[PDB]
Amino acid sequence: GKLMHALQYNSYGGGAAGLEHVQVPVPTPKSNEVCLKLEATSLNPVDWKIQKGMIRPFLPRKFPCIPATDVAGEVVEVGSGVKNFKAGDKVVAVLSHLGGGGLAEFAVATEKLTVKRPQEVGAAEAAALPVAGLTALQALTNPAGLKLDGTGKKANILVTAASGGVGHYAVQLAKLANAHVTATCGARNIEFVKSLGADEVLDYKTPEGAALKSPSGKKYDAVVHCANGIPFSVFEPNLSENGKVIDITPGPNAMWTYAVKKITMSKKQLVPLLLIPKAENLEFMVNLVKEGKVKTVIDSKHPLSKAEDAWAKSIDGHATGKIIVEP
Ligand SMILES: NC(=O)c1ccc[n+]([C@@H]2O[C@H](COP(=O)([O-])OP(=O)(O)OC[C@H]3O[C@@H](n4cnc5c(N)ncnc54)[C@H](OP(=O)(O)O)[C@@H]3O)[C@@H](O)[C@H]2O)c1
């Protein structure tokens, strides 16, 4: 019965204050799970949303909850039925949102959602990938219908909040797909988003950025919508005839909009997106980082002993790239 350091919250609404440092049993791998000694964990906005109560009645399943799901680490123990990993292997993995366990010294992941991390890729650089990166990949690959080898159709992509976790992957992945990328962000990251490969960058505080209006007049074929303030009517004049707004933060309004735009057979569509994590895709993204085709941008690094600072930074929402917790 080894013990570990972890952070957990015990109730809704506590913010970073409600995040409490605790000493808890190291989890035991089931027959299909692996136990990782964590080398890096990355936060996602859904992590603090769950704690706030915004994902009720789905999450969290039970209190207390150890938050975060994107991890990179070293395998220390594998389950009786695990074939692809042994102790000592460096990996990157996605933890179940049901059980969490990223802000801890150790975590268990299923074999299905664990991928070998090549030595060319650091732990933090890899831990930033699972949620943010796979979401960008899914949005551009399914609804936007792009191909990242070069077969794909030419296209105009808008990426809102291009400076955040999903956004900053989306911009880079979109360029690998030979698309014209228009991006929105704050004034301080304009040069940053340009360096990711965006053809046009808008400051969303300016009138033109708020209208999402392309400085060269482009109509968008698909929007990877990573921000939150914007009603469909703002997107509509900027969409091509059959353009899709891919809302990666679907709420009740999005769902309803989706419904009536299906019902009324609208040519311009709003499409909710719910990430489906698959190892093939994680393996694919990790490989892109290895080959230097995609770079992970890290907002900040925090030790586990001060992880409430990383949490606060997530909550605040001004992250540029991915927030990382290290041991
Ligand atoms: N459905 C799913 O499966 C799924 C998966 C992943 C994420 N999400 C959701 O998608 C959202 C974004 O995720 P994320 O990790 O990429 O967020 P994030 O990294 O935490 O957001 C940070 C960036 O967004 C920028 N931003 C905020 N408001 C903006 C606006 N109105 N216009 C342009 N930029 C803006 C911020 O810029 P400034 O500091 O300059 O203001 C900041 O740099 C979250 O709501 C998240 O829950 C959903």
Numbering used by the authors: 3 to 329
Verbatim from the authors:
The chloroplast envelope Quinone Oxidoreductase Homolog (ceQORH; At4g13010; molecular weight 34,034 Da) from Arabidopsis thaliana is associated to the inner membrane of the chloroplast envelope where it represents 1–2% of the crude envelope proteins. Despite its original annotation as a “QOR,” ceQORH is inactive on quinones but preferentially reduces γ-ketols in the presence of NADPH. γ-ketols are long-chain reactive electrophile oxylipins and are potentially toxic. The ceQORH monomer is formed of two domains with (i) the catalytic domain including residues from Gly3 to Pro132 and from Leu277 to Pro329 and (ii) the cofactor binding domain (Val133 to Leu276) showing the classical motif of Rossmann fold. In the ceQORH structure, the internal chloroplast targeting sequence is folded as a two anti-parallel β-strands (Thr71 to Gly81 and Asp91 to Leu97) connected by a long loop (Ser82 to Gly90).
In the crystals of the binary and ternary complexes ceQORH-13-KOTE and ceQORH-NADP+-13-KOTE, the asymmetric unit contains 12 and 8 ceQORH molecules, respectively. NADP+ is bound at the interface of the two domains and the nicotinamide ring is in the vicinity of the catalytic site. Comparison of apo-ceQORH and ceQORH-NADP+-13-KOTE monomers shows that NADP+ binding introduces local changes in the vicinity of the cofactor. The orientation of the Arg190 side chain is modified, stabilizing the 2′-phosphate of the NADP+ adenosine moiety. The loop containing Thr251 in the Rossmann fold shifts and stabilizes the ribose group of the NADP+ nicotinamide moiety by interacting with the Thr251 hydroxyl group. In the ceQORH-NADP+-13-KOTE structure, the aliphatic chain of 13-KOTE is observed in electron density up to the C11 atom of the α,β-unsaturated carbon-carbon bond (C11 = C12). The distance average between the C11 atom and the C4 atom of the NADP+ nicotinamide ring bearing the hydride is 6.84 Å. The flexibility of 13-KOTE and the large distance between the α,β-unsaturated carbon-carbon bond (C11 = C12) and the C4 atom of NADP+ nicotinamide ring are not compatible with a hydride transfer. The new position of the α-helix Pro254-Met267 observed in ceQORH-NADP+-13-KOTE could prevent the dimer formation when ceQORH binds NADPH and may explain why ceQORH-NADPH behaves as a monomer in solution.
